[PDB]
Amino acid sequence: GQQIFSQALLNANRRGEAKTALAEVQARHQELLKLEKSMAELTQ
């Protein structure tokens, strides 16, 4: 006897799209910077 609409909430669960990962990529960046520095010495 009644119809209804629909409204969205969340993107994933505990974690959110704003900080999706926000670690698995940052620390990797630190690894890549280390790689870049070592390559600098090796090529030199």
Partner: peptide
């Protein structure tokens, strides 16, 4: 693990080139 292995290989090659 692949990136850490790569880093290890580069460090070893740096050592060899320094020698």
């Amino acid at each position: 693990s692949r990136t850490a292995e790569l880093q290890a290989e580069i460090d070893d090659t740096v050592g060899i080139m320094r020698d």
